[PDB]
Design a binder for this molecule. Structure first.
Ligand code: NA
Ligand code: NA
Ligand code: NA
Lengths: 251, 251, 251
């Protein structure tokens, strides 16, 4: 399976598992993440989510082939279900970033609660290098999380951060040796899952309630511009340039 | 007295003084803090407040006995007067955190202006460990102050920060050796008190004016949920578990 | 000229050049900066701005003589044109802070995108030491950028930050040796200027769109109070005190 799932000690562990494609997110994986996060809200015996990935990468971003598949989905697109499920999840989420977190690998962290990283973790949101724009309301949430200057160094200039730089900016709050990241993140998730459940749920609701409506509105504003860029010559050329091993040209 | 007060060089020095109970806040102390902060607004010759505490602790949080006293107060509860007085204080406040600042010891700092700490200072807002929720509008202000990731590591996971971690997160901006914290904080308070008074008052008004209304609204939203949790089985059990030296159980 | 301008590789390089007065901003310089930033919006072949200054200072703030010139300007004051042009600039701006950035030298950075500094850079916004109030919407933007505690240590207490402290607070995101700051900042500006132009422009629009309207409203609120302080006894006395080599007295 592309998403490994286990449930113990009232923690739902979700492990992204396509190490062959550097844990690139496709339709199937988005659908499965959405399914599990929705499950967490409705089961009162699920009190924390631990999210991580197998191997040396957290995720390399959107799967390219699956990104540009002409065959449109039945019903709501899986990426949209995922963004809605993670942005509205009532359950506290601990995320353990085990390696490079690129694009949607970075932006999904803004909707997690406890954000921890290994020393080998890296972070990038290079929307401009591919000719696209911020998604998952990161145009609102990234500056709130790290300030305007870090947010622009990431989103406009395409900077890659290491784990220590992410910590100093406040994007992550703990950095562990690679070999203990998961065990230490699980210990924290288990502790949260053992606390008074309504206390935790209400506390998160109060915290997330401040920007809840603007988060949904910003995803729609970004989405319109994103769709337009995805279908434009600028996207084609950014992508073609990389595969043709040349500098992109924009007249 | 539980609050030592002096006035010199146009600085009102407020020193919390219940070292026997680790400077735990009770009704009397809240009332006295409220009285002094209100005085600061109305006296034009009081131009800065220096807030600190005696001994090795800044404050251990709410006094438990006084917290759950069935005998209700006459008029407005002292904690409410305090939160209103500190959130609306027009006078600049320098706070020198001399040791552990727990619960309301942490959240009151979000309503101070200059936030300084000793090397022995520690910071915690473990609302979830006691089965409660954020107060004093910290569900809004804590993420603004340190970002979403630090704010959740504090409020949901119950993390304890040392002084250097608080500095790196931006919760405090200076860390001093214990034996000079107070003298160095007073020097800064005296300098501010010697500046053009309307310049300082208006500058603070502009800064605080951005979230002024949302701060009051958020305290009311938090307050309803807080009262409900305080009277619930989850609070009883969280507290009983600690005193009975056992793991809490929430079905 | 007081502003050196060059255009190469689709980067408009703007270098503030009054090293004789420590790069103090006067009417002429504001007008020239406004002219160039407006040019950047309307020329599709200008895709990044690099802003820096000659010598050992970025800017010492407002030119005092020019500040209090009784002869009023024809049309819109140059400072207002500049603040409007930089706050609404559609072009990404890389700013390389080569030395002390004082007052408007600090606040203009909140409207730049990529904020980089030399090791000799220093930062100060001492509005209260001169009897004035925050400008250029820094009463809103500074706390968003660095948190409430850093913002107050700057604006109320008049703290001077070095480059490493600015980095740790997130006001700047890179610190370079003095002798490479400009070359490294230009390399980044050139890279941004080579990316898909609508991708970059829209990305910045989404990021800046969140606070765009409040930034303009806050400049007007600050402006009214500022004008009042500038014409008051408090300003006269703050300034006179410095020149008369004495402590200011405010009854
Ligand atoms: Na649940
Ligand atoms: Na006063
Ligand atoms: Na342009």
């Amino acid at each position: 399976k592309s998403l490994n799932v286990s449930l113990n000690n009232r923690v739902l562990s979700l492990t992204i598992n396509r190490p062959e494609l550097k844990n690139a997110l496709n339709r199937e994986l988005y659908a499965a993440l959405a399914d599990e996060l929705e499950r967490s809200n409705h089961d009162d015996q699920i009190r924390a989510v631990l999210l991580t990935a197998n191997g040396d990468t957290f995720t390399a971003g959107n799967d390219l082939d699956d990104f540009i598949n002409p065959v449109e989905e039945s019903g709501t697109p899986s990426v949209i279900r995922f963004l809605k499920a993670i942005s509205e999840c009532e359950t506290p989420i601990v995320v353990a970033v085990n390696g490079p977190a690129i694009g949607v690998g970075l932006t999904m962290l803004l909707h997690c609660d406890m954000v921890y990283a290994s020393k080998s973790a890296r972070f990038r949101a290079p929307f401009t290098h591919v000719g696209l724009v911020p998604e998952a309301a990161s145009s609102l949430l990234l500056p709130l999380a790290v300030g305007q200057a870090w947010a622009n160094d990431l989103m406009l200039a395409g900077r890659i951060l290491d784990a220590r730089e992410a910590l100093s900016a406040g994007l992550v709050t703990r950095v562990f040796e690679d070999d203990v990241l998961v065990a230490e993140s699980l210990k924290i998730a288990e502790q949260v899952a053992s606390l008074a459940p309504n206390s935790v749920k209400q506390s998160k609701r109060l915290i997330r309630g401040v920007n809840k409506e603007e988060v949904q509105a910003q995803m729609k504003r970004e989405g319109v511009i994103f769709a337009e860029q995805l279908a434009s010559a600028e996207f084609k050329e950014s992508v073609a340039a990389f595969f043709e091993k040349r500098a992109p040209h924009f007249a």
